[PDB]
Amino acid sequence: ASENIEVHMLNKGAEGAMVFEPAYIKANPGDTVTFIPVDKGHNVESIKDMIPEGAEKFKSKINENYVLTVTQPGAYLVKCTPHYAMGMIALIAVGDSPANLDQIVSAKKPKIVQERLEKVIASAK
Ligand SMILES: [Cu+2]
């Protein structure tokens, strides 16, 4: 069955300022991911060329509870549009072995983002 996972958007979390909690999401195809802003001023958006081929781009409105359906297997890098430069990202691993994860780790992106992205990848390891 399809499960729903809740992800929160916070000004301050345990890992720092401007975060997605959790920042790492393990899901199966057909799962929904619900993005919930706790504080005002956050949204969720897929980052260009950081979702698997076949997946559709999306961008939520600020403060709305966004329901994302993941169909394609692989890795999804998401961001909060206004705080992406501050490291506000979340990774969604749908299925096993996202082949595009390598491509997501190497893609050009803010240095503070790379730090968080790597750290979540190591913790999931
Ligand atoms: Cu934000």
mmCIF file with all atom_site columns, N, CA and C in Angstrom, residues 1-5 24-34 52 68-76 91-98:
data_model
loop_
_atom_site.group_PDB
_atom_site.id
_atom_site.type_symbol
_atom_site.label_atom_id
_atom_site.label_alt_id
_atom_site.label_comp_id
_atom_site.label_asym_id
_atom_site.label_entity_id
_atom_site.label_seq_id
_atom_site.pdbx_PDB_ins_code
_atom_site.Cartn_x
_atom_site.Cartn_y
_atom_site.Cartn_z
_atom_site.occupancy
_atom_site.B_iso_or_equiv
_atom_site.pdbx_formal_charge
_atom_site.auth_seq_id
_atom_site.auth_comp_id
_atom_site.auth_asym_id
_atom_site.auth_atom_id
_atom_site.pdbx_PDB_model_num
ATOM 1   N N  . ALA A 1 1  ? 0.813  -1.189 0.000   1.00 0.00 ? 1  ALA A N  1
ATOM 2   C CA . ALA A 1 1  ? 0.000  0.000  0.000   1.00 0.00 ? 1  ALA A CA 1
ATOM 3   C C  . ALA A 1 1  ? 0.847  1.240  0.000   1.00 0.00 ? 1  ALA A C  1
ATOM 4   N N  . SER A 1 2  ? 0.267  2.345  -0.457  1.00 0.00 ? 2  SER A N  1
ATOM 5   C CA . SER A 1 2  ? 0.964  3.622  -0.496  1.00 0.00 ? 2  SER A CA 1
ATOM 6   C C  . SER A 1 2  ? 0.908  4.286  0.876   1.00 0.00 ? 2  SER A C  1
ATOM 7   N N  . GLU A 1 3  ? 2.066  4.711  1.370   1.00 0.00 ? 3  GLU A N  1
ATOM 8   C CA . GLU A 1 3  ? 2.161  5.335  2.642   1.00 0.00 ? 3  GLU A CA 1
ATOM 9   C C  . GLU A 1 3  ? 2.402  6.810  2.478   1.00 0.00 ? 3  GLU A C  1
ATOM 10  N N  . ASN A 1 4  ? 2.054  7.561  3.469   1.00 0.00 ? 4  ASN A N  1
ATOM 11  C CA . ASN A 1 4  ? 2.317  8.989  3.453   1.00 0.00 ? 4  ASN A CA 1
ATOM 12  C C  . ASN A 1 4  ? 3.338  9.314  4.539   1.00 0.00 ? 4  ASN A C  1
ATOM 13  N N  . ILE A 1 5  ? 4.320  10.144 4.202   1.00 0.00 ? 5  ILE A N  1
ATOM 14  C CA . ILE A 1 5  ? 5.395  10.542 5.106   1.00 0.00 ? 5  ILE A CA 1
ATOM 15  C C  . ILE A 1 5  ? 5.308  12.044 5.277   1.00 0.00 ? 5  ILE A C  1
ATOM 16  N N  . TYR A 1 24 ? 16.184 13.580 5.224   1.00 0.00 ? 24 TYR A N  1
ATOM 17  C CA . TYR A 1 24 ? 16.389 12.410 4.454   1.00 0.00 ? 24 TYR A CA 1
ATOM 18  C C  . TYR A 1 24 ? 15.147 11.573 4.463   1.00 0.00 ? 24 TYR A C  1
ATOM 19  N N  . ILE A 1 25 ? 14.624 11.260 3.310   1.00 0.00 ? 25 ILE A N  1
ATOM 20  C CA . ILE A 1 25 ? 13.415 10.502 3.226   1.00 0.00 ? 25 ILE A CA 1
ATOM 21  C C  . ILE A 1 25 ? 13.528 9.228  2.410   1.00 0.00 ? 25 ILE A C  1
ATOM 22  N N  . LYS A 1 26 ? 13.285 8.091  3.024   1.00 0.00 ? 26 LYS A N  1
ATOM 23  C CA . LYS A 1 26 ? 13.270 6.825  2.336   1.00 0.00 ? 26 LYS A CA 1
ATOM 24  C C  . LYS A 1 26 ? 11.819 6.500  1.991   1.00 0.00 ? 26 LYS A C  1
ATOM 25  N N  . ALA A 1 27 ? 11.534 6.285  0.723   1.00 0.00 ? 27 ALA A N  1
ATOM 26  C CA . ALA A 1 27 ? 10.171 6.044  0.264   1.00 0.00 ? 27 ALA A CA 1
ATOM 27  C C  . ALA A 1 27 ? 10.175 4.973  -0.819  1.00 0.00 ? 27 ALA A C  1
ATOM 28  N N  . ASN A 1 28 ? 9.020  4.425  -1.050  1.00 0.00 ? 28 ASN A N  1
ATOM 29  C CA . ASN A 1 28 ? 8.787  3.484  -2.123  1.00 0.00 ? 28 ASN A CA 1
ATOM 30  C C  . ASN A 1 28 ? 7.938  4.180  -3.189  1.00 0.00 ? 28 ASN A C  1
ATOM 31  N N  . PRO A 1 29 ? 7.976  3.687  -4.400  1.00 0.00 ? 29 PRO A N  1
ATOM 32  C CA . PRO A 1 29 ? 7.211  4.277  -5.475  1.00 0.00 ? 29 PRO A CA 1
ATOM 33  C C  . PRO A 1 29 ? 5.744  4.219  -5.142  1.00 0.00 ? 29 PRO A C  1
ATOM 34  N N  . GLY A 1 30 ? 5.023  5.284  -5.353  1.00 0.00 ? 30 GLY A N  1
ATOM 35  C CA . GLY A 1 30 ? 3.630  5.319  -5.007  1.00 0.00 ? 30 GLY A CA 1
ATOM 36  C C  . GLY A 1 30 ? 3.344  5.916  -3.650  1.00 0.00 ? 30 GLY A C  1
ATOM 37  N N  . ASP A 1 31 ? 4.378  6.330  -2.973  1.00 0.00 ? 31 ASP A N  1
ATOM 38  C CA . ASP A 1 31 ? 4.277  6.942  -1.705  1.00 0.00 ? 31 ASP A CA 1
ATOM 39  C C  . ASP A 1 31 ? 4.057  8.435  -1.880  1.00 0.00 ? 31 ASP A C  1
ATOM 40  N N  . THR A 1 32 ? 3.383  9.023  -0.932  1.00 0.00 ? 32 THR A N  1
ATOM 41  C CA . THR A 1 32 ? 3.193  10.440 -0.907  1.00 0.00 ? 32 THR A CA 1
ATOM 42  C C  . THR A 1 32 ? 4.079  11.031 0.186   1.00 0.00 ? 32 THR A C  1
ATOM 43  N N  . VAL A 1 33 ? 4.562  12.221 -0.048  1.00 0.00 ? 33 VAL A N  1
ATOM 44  C CA . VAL A 1 33 ? 5.350  12.928 0.903   1.00 0.00 ? 33 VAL A CA 1
ATOM 45  C C  . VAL A 1 33 ? 4.668  14.237 1.156   1.00 0.00 ? 33 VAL A C  1
ATOM 46  N N  . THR A 1 34 ? 4.277  14.506 2.375   1.00 0.00 ? 34 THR A N  1
ATOM 47  C CA . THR A 1 34 ? 3.607  15.732 2.723   1.00 0.00 ? 34 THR A CA 1
ATOM 48  C C  . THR A 1 34 ? 4.528  16.729 3.408   1.00 0.00 ? 34 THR A C  1
ATOM 49  N N  . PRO A 1 52 ? 14.698 12.304 -10.779 1.00 0.00 ? 52 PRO A N  1
ATOM 50  C CA . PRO A 1 52 ? 14.909 11.292 -11.805 1.00 0.00 ? 52 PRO A CA 1
ATOM 51  C C  . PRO A 1 52 ? 14.141 11.554 -13.097 1.00 0.00 ? 52 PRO A C  1
ATOM 52  N N  . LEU A 1 68 ? 3.340  15.532 -2.306  1.00 0.00 ? 68 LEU A N  1
ATOM 53  C CA . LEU A 1 68 ? 4.165  15.048 -3.398  1.00 0.00 ? 68 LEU A CA 1
ATOM 54  C C  . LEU A 1 68 ? 3.965  13.548 -3.551  1.00 0.00 ? 68 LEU A C  1
ATOM 55  N N  . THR A 1 69 ? 3.691  13.100 -4.750  1.00 0.00 ? 69 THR A N  1
ATOM 56  C CA . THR A 1 69 ? 3.558  11.698 -5.036  1.00 0.00 ? 69 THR A CA 1
ATOM 57  C C  . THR A 1 69 ? 4.835  11.287 -5.699  1.00 0.00 ? 69 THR A C  1
ATOM 58  N N  . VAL A 1 70 ? 5.541  10.289 -5.216  1.00 0.00 ? 70 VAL A N  1
ATOM 59  C CA . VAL A 1 70 ? 6.769  9.843  -5.877  1.00 0.00 ? 70 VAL A CA 1
ATOM 60  C C  . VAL A 1 70 ? 6.478  8.570  -6.612  1.00 0.00 ? 70 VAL A C  1
ATOM 61  N N  . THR A 1 71 ? 6.719  8.576  -7.892  1.00 0.00 ? 71 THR A N  1
ATOM 62  C CA . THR A 1 71 ? 6.394  7.470  -8.728  1.00 0.00 ? 71 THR A CA 1
ATOM 63  C C  . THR A 1 71 ? 7.645  6.835  -9.235  1.00 0.00 ? 71 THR A C  1
ATOM 64  N N  . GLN A 1 72 ? 8.553  7.651  -9.708  1.00 0.00 ? 72 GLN A N  1
ATOM 65  C CA . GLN A 1 72 ? 9.771  7.167  -10.234 1.00 0.00 ? 72 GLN A CA 1
ATOM 66  C C  . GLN A 1 72 ? 10.709 6.808  -9.181  1.00 0.00 ? 72 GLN A C  1
ATOM 67  N N  . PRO A 1 73 ? 11.416 5.734  -9.364  1.00 0.00 ? 73 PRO A N  1
ATOM 68  C CA . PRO A 1 73 ? 12.408 5.391  -8.382  1.00 0.00 ? 73 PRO A CA 1
ATOM 69  C C  . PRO A 1 73 ? 13.646 6.237  -8.596  1.00 0.00 ? 73 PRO A C  1
ATOM 70  N N  . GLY A 1 74 ? 14.361 6.477  -7.528  1.00 0.00 ? 74 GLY A N  1
ATOM 71  C CA . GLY A 1 74 ? 15.561 7.257  -7.557  1.00 0.00 ? 74 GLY A CA 1
ATOM 72  C C  . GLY A 1 74 ? 15.665 8.340  -6.519  1.00 0.00 ? 74 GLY A C  1
ATOM 73  N N  . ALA A 1 75 ? 16.559 9.273  -6.744  1.00 0.00 ? 75 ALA A N  1
ATOM 74  C CA . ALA A 1 75 ? 16.786 10.355 -5.822  1.00 0.00 ? 75 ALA A CA 1
ATOM 75  C C  . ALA A 1 75 ? 16.237 11.699 -6.173  1.00 0.00 ? 75 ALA A C  1
ATOM 76  N N  . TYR A 1 76 ? 15.651 12.355 -5.208  1.00 0.00 ? 76 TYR A N  1
ATOM 77  C CA . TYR A 1 76 ? 15.075 13.664 -5.412  1.00 0.00 ? 76 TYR A CA 1
ATOM 78  C C  . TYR A 1 76 ? 15.627 14.739 -4.535  1.00 0.00 ? 76 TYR A C  1
ATOM 79  N N  . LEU A 1 91 ? 16.372 15.319 0.823   1.00 0.00 ? 91 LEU A N  1
ATOM 80  C CA . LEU A 1 91 ? 16.623 14.292 -0.148  1.00 0.00 ? 91 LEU A CA 1
ATOM 81  C C  . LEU A 1 91 ? 15.656 13.179 -0.003  1.00 0.00 ? 91 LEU A C  1
ATOM 82  N N  . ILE A 1 92 ? 15.062 12.746 -1.085  1.00 0.00 ? 92 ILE A N  1
ATOM 83  C CA . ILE A 1 92 ? 14.124 11.675 -1.095  1.00 0.00 ? 92 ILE A CA 1
ATOM 84  C C  . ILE A 1 92 ? 14.657 10.476 -1.863  1.00 0.00 ? 92 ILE A C  1
ATOM 85  N N  . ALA A 1 93 ? 14.903 9.356  -1.178  1.00 0.00 ? 93 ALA A N  1
ATOM 86  C CA . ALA A 1 93 ? 15.389 8.136  -1.828  1.00 0.00 ? 93 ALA A CA 1
ATOM 87  C C  . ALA A 1 93 ? 14.193 7.208  -2.025  1.00 0.00 ? 93 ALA A C  1
ATOM 88  N N  . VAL A 1 94 ? 13.787 7.076  -3.245  1.00 0.00 ? 94 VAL A N  1
ATOM 89  C CA . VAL A 1 94 ? 12.701 6.253  -3.602  1.00 0.00 ? 94 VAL A CA 1
ATOM 90  C C  . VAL A 1 94 ? 13.293 5.022  -4.222  1.00 0.00 ? 94 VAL A C  1
ATOM 91  N N  . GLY A 1 95 ? 13.000 3.873  -3.669  1.00 0.00 ? 95 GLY A N  1
ATOM 92  C CA . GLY A 1 95 ? 13.561 2.653  -4.179  1.00 0.00 ? 95 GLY A CA 1
ATOM 93  C C  . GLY A 1 95 ? 14.963 2.428  -3.682  1.00 0.00 ? 95 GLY A C  1
ATOM 94  N N  . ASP A 1 96 ? 15.628 1.466  -4.272  1.00 0.00 ? 96 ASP A N  1
ATOM 95  C CA . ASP A 1 96 ? 16.987 1.144  -3.891  1.00 0.00 ? 96 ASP A CA 1
ATOM 96  C C  . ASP A 1 96 ? 17.967 1.613  -4.951  1.00 0.00 ? 96 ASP A C  1
ATOM 97  N N  . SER A 1 97 ? 19.106 2.107  -4.492  1.00 0.00 ? 97 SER A N  1
ATOM 98  C CA . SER A 1 97 ? 20.184 2.601  -5.353  1.00 0.00 ? 97 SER A CA 1
ATOM 99  C C  . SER A 1 97 ? 19.798 3.646  -6.392  1.00 0.00 ? 97 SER A C  1
ATOM 100 N N  . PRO A 1 98 ? 19.557 4.866  -5.962  1.00 0.00 ? 98 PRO A N  1
ATOM 101 C CA . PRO A 1 98 ? 19.243 5.907  -6.917  1.00 0.00 ? 98 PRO A CA 1
ATOM 102 C C  . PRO A 1 98 ? 20.464 6.066  -7.760  1.00 0.00 ? 98 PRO A C  1
#
